[PDB]
Scaffold this active site. Structure first.
Site, PDB file in Angstrom:
ATOM      1  CG  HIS A   1      -0.621   0.661   3.076  1.00  0.00           C
ATOM      2  ND1 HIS A   1      -0.155   1.710   2.812  1.00  0.00           N
ATOM      3  CD2 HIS A   1      -0.730  -0.762   3.101  1.00  0.00           C
ATOM      4  CE1 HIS A   1      -0.047   1.048   4.233  1.00  0.00           C
ATOM      5  NE2 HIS A   1      -0.350   0.022   4.785  1.00  0.00           N
TER       6      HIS A   1
ATOM      7  N   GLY B   1       2.174   5.957  10.349  1.00  0.00           N
ATOM      8  CA  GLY B   1       3.765   6.006  10.361  1.00  0.00           C
ATOM      9  C   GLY B   1       4.916   4.384  10.167  1.00  0.00           C
TER      10      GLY B   1
ATOM     11  CB  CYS C   1       2.254   0.823   7.655  1.00  0.00           C
ATOM     12  SG  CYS C   1       0.725   0.714   8.413  1.00  0.00           S
TER      13      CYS C   1
HETATM   14  C1  LIG Z   1      -8.715   5.419   8.208  1.00  0.00           C
HETATM   15  N1  LIG Z   1      -7.420   5.516   8.591  1.00  0.00           N
HETATM   16  C2  LIG Z   1      -7.444   4.568   9.643  1.00  0.00           C
HETATM   17  C3  LIG Z   1      -7.858   4.947  10.771  1.00  0.00           C
HETATM   18  C4  LIG Z   1      -8.648   3.585  11.348  1.00  0.00           C
HETATM   19  N2  LIG Z   1      -9.890   2.854  11.962  1.00  0.00           N
HETATM   20  S1  LIG Z   1      -6.012   6.281   7.649  1.00  0.00           S
HETATM   21  O1  LIG Z   1      -5.215   6.948   8.142  1.00  0.00           O
HETATM   22  O2  LIG Z   1      -7.019   6.387   6.301  1.00  0.00           O
HETATM   23  N3  LIG Z   1      -5.489   4.288   6.655  1.00  0.00           N
HETATM   24  C5  LIG Z   1      -6.164   3.603   5.798  1.00  0.00           C
HETATM   25  C6  LIG Z   1      -5.845   2.719   5.354  1.00  0.00           C
HETATM   26  C7  LIG Z   1      -6.322   1.264   4.540  1.00  0.00           C
HETATM   27  C8  LIG Z   1      -5.813   0.297   4.715  1.00  0.00           C
HETATM   28  C9  LIG Z   1      -4.888   0.234   4.797  1.00  0.00           C
HETATM   29 CL1  LIG Z   1      -3.363  -1.352   4.571  1.00  0.00          CL
HETATM   30  C10 LIG Z   1      -4.073   1.191   5.601  1.00  0.00           C
HETATM   31  C11 LIG Z   1      -4.136   2.147   6.078  1.00  0.00           C
HETATM   32  C12 LIG Z   1      -3.756   3.060   7.311  1.00  0.00           C
HETATM   33  C13 LIG Z   1      -4.039   2.504   8.312  1.00  0.00           C
HETATM   34  O3  LIG Z   1      -3.990   2.235   8.821  1.00  0.00           O
HETATM   35  N4  LIG Z   1      -2.754   2.816   8.979  1.00  0.00           N
HETATM   36  C14 LIG Z   1      -2.504   2.979  10.851  1.00  0.00           C
HETATM   37  C15 LIG Z   1      -1.505   1.794  10.918  1.00  0.00           C
HETATM   38  N5  LIG Z   1      -1.574   1.386  11.952  1.00  0.00           N
HETATM   39  C16 LIG Z   1      -2.377   2.382  13.002  1.00  0.00           C
HETATM   40  C17 LIG Z   1      -2.376   3.706  13.128  1.00  0.00           C
HETATM   41  C18 LIG Z   1      -3.209   4.324  13.473  1.00  0.00           C
HETATM   42  C19 LIG Z   1      -4.069   5.525  13.462  1.00  0.00           C
HETATM   43  C20 LIG Z   1      -3.686   5.872  12.275  1.00  0.00           C
HETATM   44  C21 LIG Z   1      -3.386   5.192  10.993  1.00  0.00           C
HETATM   45  C22 LIG Z   1      -2.286   4.010  11.557  1.00  0.00           C
HETATM   46  C23 LIG Z   1      -4.335   4.318   6.641  1.00  0.00           C
END
Ligand SMILES: CN(CCC#N)S(=O)(=O)N1Cc2ccc(Cl)cc2[C@H](C(=O)Nc2cncc3ccccc23)C1
Ligand SMILES: CN(CCC#N)S(=O)(=O)N1Cc2ccc(Cl)cc2[C@H](C(=O)Nc2cncc3ccccc23)C1
Ligand SMILES: [Cl-]
Lengths: 299, 305
Positions: free
Chosen positions: A41, A137, A139
């Site tokens: 991603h 951040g 991931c």
């Molecule tokens: C809607 N979001 C997630 C929040 C909830 N519910 S996002 O920030 O737009 N996000 C969308 C998304 C969609 C698919 C995939 Cl595979 C990954 C991701 C991202 C994600 O998940 N990142 C994060 C990981 N780990 C921790 C987190 C903590 C805070 C915020 C992002 C965190 C970003």
């Protein structure tokens, strides 16, 4: 004496963490030999092969400490991006990629911008999520176990679910659980307690002198599971019983004898008492973690 | 989201761990530059421990009596000196893996990571706090002596603890890296016990602010309290007195969440009176005191849910 949630020493994994930037997305990568593994991603109805074909090697910026690594190739394996780099990691340890089962525990080296910030221990829940501690951040952060001198990579972080729990893949890009790597409506299923792990933690308590919950009673495996199912506890199998054998011999408490104690704790609670400093029954220590912490196995 | 007891990455400390052997005793040492630091009790017999005269035992030793092992390599000892309860062994080889470091003495309530080692090999890492009674609630077996406690804020390792002994209740006692014990303890097998322990009030408050940041406010109430009235209640539950310094330190968390420290103090008073009533806070059924106000700011987001 003492019983703590203990992680594996993270040093062999710290030397593998890198920063991966692709356009507006910056996350972590695992640099092993001449390949950097990261969630696919970072390239982001996502047709990932179609989004990837547009990209060239120089679009992916890889940073290892203060040094820029040069990407010479790229391929996708399930939900992981494999970036071929020009330099092999001199700090590459002896490693394996392993897929874990729910109930198994592992260490997480949480990273931001390719820099490790903390290490913690956690378990793969029966519902395939992990109750981690991650911010945006994080991931690409990895989960691992160490067996002797070999690092077994078992998890790579991908996303957070609306309840605060986490989802990710093994190092071959296959998700744990019915999750997908995209912005869609997805939720963690109803969770259950890891029964074999609570039992192991009750044996750890007996080893440390906490015997107030012991009783004269025993139970059948079938009668224990009839009770366990009513409290959202995972069914206890004959395999679980066999795995608890060493702890049963060490303390002198038969697994079904300790099961009758768990049965009494489930119907009556703790009544103002604690077990190993906890007012809840703990399920994130496997039978092997209890043995390793109460023997002193080194790495 | 999420709130875990998180330790510092241990790699910078792993590359410092060595094995120290003196006669029949074997424990861990910290190799920094050309010196290996270890508990001075490595020179003692089990008998000696009742009333050891370390100065008299040390004068009888030469450099070759101390065997130092770094991985598969034997280090050669070229000098030795004692500094309080720590033995400093001068070695012939400087540690190439020596990180940027400082020796810091911590105050009770401070947290740190422990790299537990046996035979110079690290086996695990965990987070813990210096209790108000100067003990640590660690997880240590025989052979763990010389394991160290540290913090890695930015790129510098701050060494704050070296393990020396286990007390009769299962709690652990040790020194800073200058060999000064934390607490009224001695590296002697004397009748000594940990004083009655107390809860680190400023840390429970910090953890309550971390729960508000993660979207949980069930425990809050419409009340406030004076600092003196809070402490009169806190003392009755074996909680450490909350000082004006503790209030000042909680300032940033108060501003981020919008809740005044003395209003957070009123929720704590209510929690002590009523218990949790089936509820949990950050996955815990007990009030947690091993996260400082600084650890909460480090782990938690800068945006409240
Ligand atoms: C809607 N979001 C997630 C929040 C909830 N519910 S996002 O920030 O737009 N996000 C969308 C998304 C969609 C698919 C995939 Cl595979 C990954 C991701 C991202 C994600 O998940 N990142 C994060 C990981 N780990 C921790 C987190 C903590 C805070 C915020 C992002 C965190 C970003
Ligand atoms: C009576 N002992 C303590 C064990 C208990 N209850 S002991 O084994 O004789 N012990 C006495 C003693 C006295 C002073 C000093 Cl500075 C050190 C030491 C040693 C010590 O404390 N070692 C240990 C440390 N840390 C953890 C441990 C766990 C288990 C077993 C030894 C552990 C040895
Ligand atoms: Cl301090």
């Amino acid at each position: 004496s003492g019983f703590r949630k203990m992680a594996f020493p993270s040093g062999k994994v710290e030397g593998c963490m890198v920063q991966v930037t692709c356009g507006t997305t910056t996350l972590n990568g695992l640099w092993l030999d001449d390949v950097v593994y990261c969630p696919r991603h970072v390239i982001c109805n996502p047709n990932y092969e179609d989004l990837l074909i547009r990209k060239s090697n120089h679009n992916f910026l890889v940073q290892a400490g203060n040094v820029q690594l040069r990407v010479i190739g790229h391929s996708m394996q399930n939900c992981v991006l494999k970036l071929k780099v020009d330099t092999a990691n001199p700090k590459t340890p002896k490693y394996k990629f392993v897929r874990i089962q729910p109930g198994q525990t592992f260490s997480v080296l949480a990273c931001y911008n390719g820099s490790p910030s903390g290490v913690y221990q956690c378990a793969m829940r029966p519902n395939f999520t992990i109750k981690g501690s991650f911010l945006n951040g994080s991931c690409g952060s990895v989960g691992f176990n160490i067996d002797y001198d070999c690092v077994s990579f078992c998890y790579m972080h991908h996303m957070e679910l609306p309840t605060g729990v986490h989802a990710g893949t093994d190092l071959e890009g296959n998700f744990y659980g019915p999750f997908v790597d995209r912005q869609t409506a997805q939720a963690a299923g109803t969770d259950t307690t890891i029964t074999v792990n609570v039992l192991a933690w009750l044996y750890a308590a007996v080893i440390n002198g906490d015997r107030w919950f012991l009783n004269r009673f025993t139970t059948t495996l079938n009668d224990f599971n009839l009770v366990a199912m009513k409290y959202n506890y995972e069914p206890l199998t004959q395999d679980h019983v066999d795995i608890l054998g060493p702890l049963s011999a060490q303390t002198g408490i038969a697994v079904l004898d300790m099961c009758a104690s768990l049965k009494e704790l489930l119907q009556n609670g703790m009544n103002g008492r604690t077990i190993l400093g906890s007012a809840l029954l703990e399920d994130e220590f496997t039978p092997f973690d209890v043995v390793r912490q109460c023997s002193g196995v080194t790495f």
